[PDB]
Amino acid sequence: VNAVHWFRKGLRLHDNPALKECIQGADTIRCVYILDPWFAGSSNVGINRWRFLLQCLEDLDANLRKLNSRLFVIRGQPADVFPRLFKEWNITKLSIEYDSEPFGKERDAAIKKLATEAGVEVIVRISHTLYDLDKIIELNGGQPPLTYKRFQTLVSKMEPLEPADTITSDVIGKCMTPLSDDHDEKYGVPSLEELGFDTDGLSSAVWPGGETEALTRLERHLERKNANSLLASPTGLSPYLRFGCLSCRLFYFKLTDLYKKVKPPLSLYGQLLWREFFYTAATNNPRFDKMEGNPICVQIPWDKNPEALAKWAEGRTGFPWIDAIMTQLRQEGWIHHLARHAVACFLTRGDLWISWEEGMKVFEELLLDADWSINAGSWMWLSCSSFFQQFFHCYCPVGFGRRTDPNGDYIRRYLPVLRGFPAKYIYDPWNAPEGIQKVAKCLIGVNYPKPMVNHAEASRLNIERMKQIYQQLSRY
Numbered sequence: 001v002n003a004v005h006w007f008r009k010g011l012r013l014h015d016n017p018a019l020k021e022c023i024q025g026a027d028t029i030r031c032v033y034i035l036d037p038w039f040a041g042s043s044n045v046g047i048n049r050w051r052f053l054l055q056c057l058e059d060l061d062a063n064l065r066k067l068n069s070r071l072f073v074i075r076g077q078p079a080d081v082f083p084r085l086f087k088e089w090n091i092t093k094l095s096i097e098y099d100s101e102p103f104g105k106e107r108d109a110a111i112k113k114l115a116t117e118a119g120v121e122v123i124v125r126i127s128h129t130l131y132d133l134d135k136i137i138e139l140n141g142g143q144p145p146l147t148y149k150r151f152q153t154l155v156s157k158m159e160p161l162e163p164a165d166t167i168t169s170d171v172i173g174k175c176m177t178p179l180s181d182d183h184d185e186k187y188g189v190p191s192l193e194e195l196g197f198d199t200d201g202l203s204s205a206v207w208p209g210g211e212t213e214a215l216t217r218l219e220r221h222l223e224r225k226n227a228n229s230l231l232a233s234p235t236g237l238s239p240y241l242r243f244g245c246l247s248c249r250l251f252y253f254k255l256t257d258l259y260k261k262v263k264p265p266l267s268l269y270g271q272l273l274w275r276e277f278f279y280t281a282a283t284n285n286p287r288f289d290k291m292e293g294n295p296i297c298v299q300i301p302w303d304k305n306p307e308a309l310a311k312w313a314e315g316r317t318g319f320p321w322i323d324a325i326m327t328q329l330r331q332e333g334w335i336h337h338l339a340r341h342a343v344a345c346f347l348t349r350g351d352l353w354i355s356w357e358e359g360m361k362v363f364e365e366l367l368l369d370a371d372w373s374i375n376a377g378s379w380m381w382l383s384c385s386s387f388f389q390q391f392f393h394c395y396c397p398v399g400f401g402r403r404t405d406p407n408g409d410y411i412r413r414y415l416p417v418l419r420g421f422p423a424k425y426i427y428d429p430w431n432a433p434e435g436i437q438k439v440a441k442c443l444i445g446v447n448y449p450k451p452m453v454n455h456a457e458a459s460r461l462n463i464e465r466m467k468q469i470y471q472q473l474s475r476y
């Protein structure tokens with residue numbers, strides 16, 4: 001009985017039902033991760049996401065060493081590699097954490113067919129989400145809830161959540177891992193260079209990957225529970241929830257019991273419920289990330305403007321607040337939710353009137369904490385393309401951050417070319433007189449671009465555009 005556990009999400013040894021069940025009754029246990037380096041550059045996956053993943057894999061491998069096992073990293077496509085491994089290792093069991101996202105579901109269905117057609121038993125267990133999303137969808141009558149309010153109703157009628165024991169020496173028991181001395185050069189965790197990324201200009205990651213870092217942060221986050229809010233927090237947990245280094249169910253229980261000790265609203269579960277809601281909404285919708293052909297998405301005639309899109313993506317808008325946020329995102333992989341509101345409003349309903357699909361693709365590349373379902377759901381939501389509950393405040397790309405940080409310390413940290421400007425002009429340097437730009441050694445339009453748009457005029461038009469869209473929807 002040779003059992004293999006396939007890692008994709010759920011990159012942890014705690015609360016891993018699929019791994020626990022696969023281990024039980026197995027003589028052999030082997031943990032695999034599959035990636036192809038040749039397609040790493042063309043997959044819209046940025047270097048920070050790759051680095052966080054590789055660090056997750058190093059931590060899994062290290063933690064597996066403590067249990068006397070090892071992680072197997074295989075280069076290739078899962079449809080091509082799994083037949084060879086079934087025969088090479090005489091696989092009897094294959095286990096995966098369930099993936100609700102449509103393209104992952106189709107991929108897993110193909111792998112399940114090949115495993116079964118080869119006489120391999122397929123173990124699937126839910127642990128990336130709090131609930132069985134198909135059970136939520138059934139309780140809603142076969143269609144996913146279209147509103148956060150309806151979703152909360154169904155969750156409130158759900159039975160209280162049960163977690164799962166951590167994989168230990170006592171859990172593994174008499175289960176072995178076949179290991180060779182050539183293992184590291186054959187199945188070792190890849191470097192970024194192997195994936196084709198230049199690392200010479202890199203600095204240490206602000207968000208270190210892995211289950212160890214996630215559980216260390218969780219204890220400090222529970223202990224603890226402006227301009228400094230914008231900076232990454234050493235107790236932030238959102239990337240670890242996305243990659244599965246931290247179980248959302250464990251996080252839920254720890255939050256509940258700390259709250260019980262401190263004092264049971266959904267104020268503290270709000271982020272997890274939004275996460276759960278977008279997974280539920282996307283799971284049966286293969287065009288969830290599209291406007292055309294997406295049955296839940298308002299059809300809005302967005303501008304097609306690649307040059308403006310590229311200015312926003314590359315932090316070259318000429319609005320330092322917007323550019324500092326997009327620069328933090330590209331450099332670190334995480335920005336504050338209020339900063340996401342700011343740059344996403346600017347791109348779509350606010351200033352540039354560019355499709356939410358284009359912002360989603362940029363965020364997909366650079367953002368560490370948003371799966372496909374959450375990214376698409378969040379972009380449709382903020383652009384009033386789906387899940388509509390109200391019109392939104394139009395954020396000011398100059399004033400909003402100025403009230404956040406009057407001195408512009410956030411601007412100065414991520415846009416060093418502007419550090420010479422005084423606070424009076426740091427958020428609108430195109431208003432600085434010529435002599436002031438010279439002193440700051442930053443000529444607007446040479447060292448830093450001019451503003452790409454007039455916010456007052458653009459936002460005024462776009463606020464009205466959105467109203468007309470929704471007046472049409474009332475008539476239909």
Ligand SMILES: COc1ccc(-n2nc3c(c2NC(=O)C2(c4ccc(Cl)cc4)CCCC2)CS(=O)(=O)C3)cc1
Nearest residue numbers: 238274275337340341344363369370374375378379382
């Ligand atoms: C703009 O692109 C993005 C903005 C946010 C995300 N994102 N990432 C995670 C989560 C979310 N989304 C949210 O929480 C909400 C949201 C939406 C839009 C904005 Cl602007 C801000 C918040 C959904 C409705 C209210 C809260 C929750 S999570 O753990 O599941 C990690 C992704 C892409």
